[PDB]
Amino acid sequence: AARVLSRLADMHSTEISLQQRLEYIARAILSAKSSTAISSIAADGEFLHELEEKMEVARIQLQIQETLQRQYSHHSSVQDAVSQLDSELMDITKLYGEFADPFKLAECKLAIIHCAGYSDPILVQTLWQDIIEKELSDSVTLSSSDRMHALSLKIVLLGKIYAGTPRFFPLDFIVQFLEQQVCTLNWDVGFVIQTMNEIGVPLPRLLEVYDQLFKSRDPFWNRMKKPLHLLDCIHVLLIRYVENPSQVLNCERRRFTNLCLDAVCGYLVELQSMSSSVAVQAITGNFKSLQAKLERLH
């Protein structure tokens, strides 16, 4: 059945003629998930990844050809390109070079490079921005709570793949960029802390990031009129540790309750140098309330 579903998923997958054969991908996926659930043979689960990888490339080619119809349908060679982005399985090279660059579909270039693999720091950091700003783009129609949830699901899914390999998951950059987006969009201060918690990022290493991002004294938080924001992040992160202490290993926790008190003393020296606005007063109260719990966690 797989060797005829391949002959309805080779030449044959979106449709690449455009719309009936995505049923053949989704149905071949259903038949291969049914095969492996009845008879867990290697090869019928090996062919399942072939189909689910083909399924995202298939959706990218649909994102391309409908966007030619939705933007460029008064140009003559869009009929040529529609009949071409019909009849065959185009690889990521064709989809970029023959269609998404000649028509200049930036939305689809971003869609292609989200799929086009991963390779070491600068390109890895661009691709994590591309993945974040695509999911921020294509969610624009939804409320902040739903867009938080969508971006959480994306970054928790891909983070559960790449966080095991710290060349492909640049944690420190992803935290800075997500907090710069939260700081812009006016989302919750618990957000990036929740996303990294639900990936499973070790909470001491998560603190090492916000600690150094605060110590950078980045002009962004100042330019967005939220020069306190990363201290509110550190407060929510450390209150989340204090009222669930299981998030630090039962040997390391005593080393960490020092480092949290040492750092909270540092942030309280910082805060008590600032102009004593109601926010600086409240956050000085929050950090002394946090201190007055950490003093019992030791």
Binding site: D80, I92, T93, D101, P102, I112, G117
Partner: peptide, 19 residues
């Protein structure tokens, strides 16, 4: 194919009739 290859050098004019 999953692999991506950029090749700006020779493309087909999307905006244009075929020769």
């Amino acid at each position: 194919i999953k692999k991506l290859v950029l090749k700006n050098l020779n493309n087909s004019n999307l905006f244009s009739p075929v020769n």
